[model samples]
Target: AEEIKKQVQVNVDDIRAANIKLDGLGRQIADISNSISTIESRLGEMDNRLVGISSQVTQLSNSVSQNTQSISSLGDRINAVEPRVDSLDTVTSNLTGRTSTLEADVGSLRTELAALTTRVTTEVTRLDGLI
Candidate 1:
């Protein structure tokens, strides 16, 4: 009978210990619920920030793309003008060479006239010889 009473007392002790453990577990669950609420709030904030950043990124991308298109158009125009500029430069060079040759020929003609003047006593005499 004493052994049975001792066993009953041990079983009651175990029940009391289990109740205490259950209380501890309940507190831990409450703490975990609080932590989960905090995490959910943080996630909501991050979600809003992500949305805002996405909008900004979209705007930036559109602006960059438009600017890139304008630059490409300008590049095409410049490329189109390139060959015309080269042709103008070539024409200018040819005109310059021809003008220099004309000046040299005029100078040579002046020298020839000076030599011919030595043979003529006067300008009228040279003109009469030509006639």
Candidate 2:
């Protein structure tokens, strides 16, 4: 009978120890639950930030596209004006040629004037001698 009582007492101590372990496990579970909640909150913040980043990236893409279009338009304008520029160059060349022709004509006129002056001076001298 004493041996049976001693066995019962040992079983009771084992049950008490098991209950304490269970309590410790419950506290651990609570800590794990709190950590999970914090992680979920951080994930939500990250998601919001990602959304903002996505919007910014879209805006940047649009800006790049606009810039590209503007450059293309500028290129088209430059191409359109190229023919006019060529015409102006041709006009300049023609003007330069006309100026050279005018210079030659002026030089001829100067030579003729000099010859006429010489003839006039000789004729006047002859007339004075005749008188």
Candidate 3:
């Protein structure tokens, strides 16, 4: 009966040791679950940042399109002004021709005036000799 009692005590010690080991394993599992939760939180934050970047990229795309349209409009205005520039060139050419004609007429008038002055001087000298 004493030997049976000793054997029962040894079995009880083994069971206690197993229960301690199971408790340690449970604590380790809890630590791993906490680590997994932290990792999921970081992933959620990264997803939100990616969404913000996508929105900024869309805004930049719209700005570039607006700039492109503004440039296109400026090009159209330049094209429309080209015909007026050609018309201005024609007017400048006509003005230059008119200036040349006026210069020729002024030269003819100076020559005629010189001839009349010479004729008047000769008539005044004859009138003084007759007096």
Candidate 4:
């Protein structure tokens, strides 16, 4: 009987410890959820701005191509523009990669939230069983 009592007390203590950890996990998840709420909107505005720059870069390329033969001294001036455009292309490429990465990260977080919900449900049942 004493051994049984000791085991029961141990189990109760373990349950309390798990419940506390779950509370902490819930708070952390809430914080992370709040932190990312504006992420999409912020990145979306920057993405739009980048697309605008890309469009302008294409216009510049077209103008340079069409007028290159007529303007002999334009080579040096447009050469500078080309490199800048190239850098813009690299930046846009990185932005594309970053957008993809953030999408994946959001997906991962959603999955984690789903799993946390399941765990919470399971814990509630366990608490019911113990109590």
Top lDDT prediction, candidate number: 2
Clashes of each: 0, 0, 0, 0
Could you estimate the TM-score for every candidate? 0.69, 0.80, 0.68, 0.42
Per-residue error for 11 in candidate 1, Å, reads 5.9
Better of 2 and 3 by TM-score: 2
Better of 1 and 4 by lDDT: 1
Model 4 clash pairs are none
Ten-residue stretch with the least lDDT total in model 3: 110-119
Clash pairs, model 2 backbone: none
Tens-place lDDT digits, model 2, residues 9-125: 999999999999999999999999999999999999999999999999999999999999999999999999999999999999999999999999999999999999999999999
Q: How should the candidates be ordered by lDDT, best one leading?
A: 2, 3, 1, 4
TM-score of 2: 0.80
Cα-based lDDT for every prediction: 0.97, 1.00, 0.98, 0.94
lDDT score for candidate 1 against the true structure? 0.97
Model 2 accuracy (lDDT, Cα): 1.00
Quality of model 4 by C-alpha lDDT: 0.94
Give residue 77's error in model 3 in angstroms. Answer: 1.7
Model 3 scores a C-alpha lDDT of: 0.98
* Residue pairs with backbone overlap in model 1: none
Q: Which residue runs of candidate 1 sit more than 4 Å off their true CA positions?
A: 1-15, 109-131
Error of 2 at 1 (Å): 1.3
Which pairs clash in the backbone of model 3? none
Across residues 35-84, which tens digit of lDDT does each residue of candidate 3 receive? 99999999999999999999999999999999999999999999999999
